[PDB]
Amino acid sequence: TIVKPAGPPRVGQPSWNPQRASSMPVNRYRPFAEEVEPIRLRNRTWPDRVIDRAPLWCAVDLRDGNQALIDPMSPARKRRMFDLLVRMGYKEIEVGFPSASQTDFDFVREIIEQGAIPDDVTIQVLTQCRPELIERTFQACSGAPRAIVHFYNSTSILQRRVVFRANRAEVQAIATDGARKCVEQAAKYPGTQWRFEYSPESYTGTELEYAKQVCDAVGEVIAPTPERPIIFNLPATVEMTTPNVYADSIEWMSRNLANRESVILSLHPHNDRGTAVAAAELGFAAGADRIEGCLFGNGERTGNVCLVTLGLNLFSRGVDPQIDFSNIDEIRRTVEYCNQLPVHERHPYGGDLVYTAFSGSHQDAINKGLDAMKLDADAADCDVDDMLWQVPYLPIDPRDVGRTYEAVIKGGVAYIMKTDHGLSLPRRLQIEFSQVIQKIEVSPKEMWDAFAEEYLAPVRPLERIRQHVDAADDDGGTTSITATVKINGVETEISGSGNGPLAAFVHALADVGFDVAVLDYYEHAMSAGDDAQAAAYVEASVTISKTVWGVGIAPSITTASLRAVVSAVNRAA
Amino acid sequence: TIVKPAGPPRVGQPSWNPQRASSMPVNRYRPFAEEVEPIRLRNRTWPDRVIDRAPLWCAVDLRDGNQALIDPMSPARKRRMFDLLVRMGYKEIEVGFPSASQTDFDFVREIIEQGAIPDDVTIQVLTQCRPELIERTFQACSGAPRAIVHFYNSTSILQRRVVFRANRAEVQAIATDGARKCVEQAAKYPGTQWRFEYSPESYTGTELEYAKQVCDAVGEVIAPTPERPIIFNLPATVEMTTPNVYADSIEWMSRNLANRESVILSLHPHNDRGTAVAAAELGFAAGADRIEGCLFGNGERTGNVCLVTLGLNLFSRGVDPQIDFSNIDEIRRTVEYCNQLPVHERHPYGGDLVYTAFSGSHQDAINKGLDAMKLDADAADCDVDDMLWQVPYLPIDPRDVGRTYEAVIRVNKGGVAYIMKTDHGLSLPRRLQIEFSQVIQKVSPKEMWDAFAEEYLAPVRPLERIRQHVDAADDDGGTTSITATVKINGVETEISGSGNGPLAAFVHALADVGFDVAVLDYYEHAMSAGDDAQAAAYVEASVTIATSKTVWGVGIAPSITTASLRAVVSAVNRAA
């Protein structure tokens, strides 16, 4: 649980800062300069550059995004994403990892065999360096008019040590042997315009000099030219530090890589620290040529850099992204359908709430802005929709992405019951009970009082005093129960038999006018420990026919279940 | 609908880039330098500074966050959020806008009158500059031991023109008149230690020289000192450009503001370009002292900067954030209850999917990392949990925030949890789902089920339960005793134990045959109904057999009791 930090403030911590040291294990984590290496770059220039052109985009939604889904794309969902990317204006699209996945293989075959690839589109496929995998990759691409074969191997300090147990020379040979195999296979497949991409995977965890050495060595194998360049893609496989440091690394690589005119320098930033978009934008200013990402940031864990945010961040500062975002709702609908994951309410440009103002003051300012625009428009005999957007609080005209400005004018049962009472209510009980609270805001204490009054407290018509359980020694034997109960205050013996104690008690009640059928049942521990309490929840149809829930809490799994039956009976009556 | 860009490429566009001009109305938008001003800071130092200490945090969840909600927080939700922020270790908390909101006013009264404010916590309240609003703000804070009065007015080029139609002097007067009123009201309430914060609102749309002019003028009125500093909060009310430009602007303000030693320089980034976290981190390196934000990036439009991401971005690089995130799911659940908005599946540190690996090769690399750490710990006679985290693909030990690394396996309308429920009637507890997926990692529905049965259901060695006699006390709270006939590696033996029920009695009975079973959690649910009714039981236990391993067991039987006993046996045999 959360324990308030109580350790001494740092020596020299300002008097106006009363924060205390936490007990989080910070010593298990090192500054980036110590984990990897310090910054090699001198006289950086990216801080002085403002982006004034679109990068070359590559959309990796169909492979890198797809790999990240709990419900992977069906062939129909794949075609719909492919079609969306084509219609938006993307010209490089990663379509699979065909040597690793038969469904990827079959998808690549399908788009090639059906003639589904536009003339200005280059499909891209991922492969590891193993020769049999590169062969299978070329097989999948057979008959493509053009293709990027993207090969990679992990180069990071960490992976060399603990994953590959290999030295720098061995790891570089993995890459150059892979490059040689690609060159061999390309010569065997005529017609196709083969293009190559190499990634030193886990680049952000790799020494820059080494990443440069491996890239250069791979380039020497491929022998690219300005007309037929190679792509070096430098991923933040884990986003390990601040975007300025990533950008410094990009500028250094851009300045130091051999044969630079024949290189397309590509970025592939993940979002582990929340700064993928920033890494991409600063990295582009640092000299990169190309950015790989996904629509709305899909990709493993925190995702790939968001292509929508990057593109509209250009548009909103007067630079054409060369991609159509005129109908962001259509893009969002299609992405949600394809991925089966929602765009968050606050996602830049696309989110439900991003063009909303709930504040009277902000609303008024927005309207003053719109009015001044309309006055300037009327004066210049212009359509206001063609004038410079000048509106407080709205970075863009929502209409320019097909959206609108909105001047907009639950009891928490599950949360409160679990947090304050250690009860995880079955969903249908949550529903059953929250309705009561609606009628009966209700404070946390009031909610509990009502819960106890309905489920826990009642002892009429039925009260269970004590009982004797005669359980079967042998698996599948009969269990008997005799209980002392009160029925509207009148002490009564009941007795029944069944496959277990819960069944036995249910059957015993029938003799006394309660026809009870158990429809569902749940139980959970209420603390750690051998002798911990149990909470039981029983859903039952009760005649003297209403279906109701009951709740029981007790030291024994058995007794909690019996209490839950009594609770249900009393609720039915 | 969507029409493919079809305009010419740019002059100078490389032949290897076939992109075409879109029909997006880019002419309606200008570069930041033209919209606002050129920000040139040739001799900037922030690019060469690595953050080495936590900033002073201020959580604005109860104000900026609250105002951004579809459904504003009820009094109970406000209190729950306040308590969460205090418990995490926040010392400055913006509790509301009491001069503008009666519910905010009543909340501030509540927390003051009920003594909910710790002695190391300073509440902060937002106010506009109208003198009657400032008066109401001080009245809301009546009785507080200390409080920050945060007053603001909009200073942007655009707002001065179209909202106020005012000159620089007029707009500055709004602020200095507010500052004057604050000084007057503070003298009337000598029982409270008053502190001030001024924001030139829409700062990122304001000329830096003007922002400095207005802040300086407000500071001359307030007359702060190093012992009693003023906070100047510089908001990216709209995030207008890239975070390096924001950072340049902060370094410039930090160098140029008058009486800098009497200033706490505060950042308040919004996320309209998706770069708020970056703007905060570069801005802090630029010389800021303080950062305002919200847990999980709640707030106006795209949100305030995420305090959770900023905090754990320090932790994961060896800097103590001075805030406790050791149970991120508790923070998440509380936030979702208060805001009634979900934390997204991919949200840094807290999202559902952020400690998962779906890739086989990543899963293998993770296993190798974990193994190599364990080998190093054994060599050093150290707890692996105390050592340098060295695991590919996982920036932090998920356990350091209360979470668990999860290898996700695809089942060939799928997934392990879903198929187990649909095809076998079992609702696997989440931790069991994770454990079993790791077994599979080390698939077809049949393969999955066969693996599950072999792991949890089939083993009869070392332990097999033959029969048992359960003597349950009749009266509530009485002791249960058990005798059981068991086979231990095939040899039949009798065991005996007592506990608060049959499960506990059985667990205790096993201790005498060299199985130490320490029950951590337990779940049970119905399968089917009537005469065909069964119970599935799940027990999580720390098991030691004559090291300890945390394992799940599963038991299925017609009796709720027998199912639970089967689950204990299952766990023991899994541990072996």
Ligand SMILES: [Cl-]
């Ligand atoms: Cl039963």
Ligand SMILES: [Cl-]
């Ligand atoms: Cl029990």
Ligand SMILES: [Mn+2]
């Ligand atoms: Mn990726």
Ligand SMILES: [Mn+2]
């Ligand atoms: Mn704000």
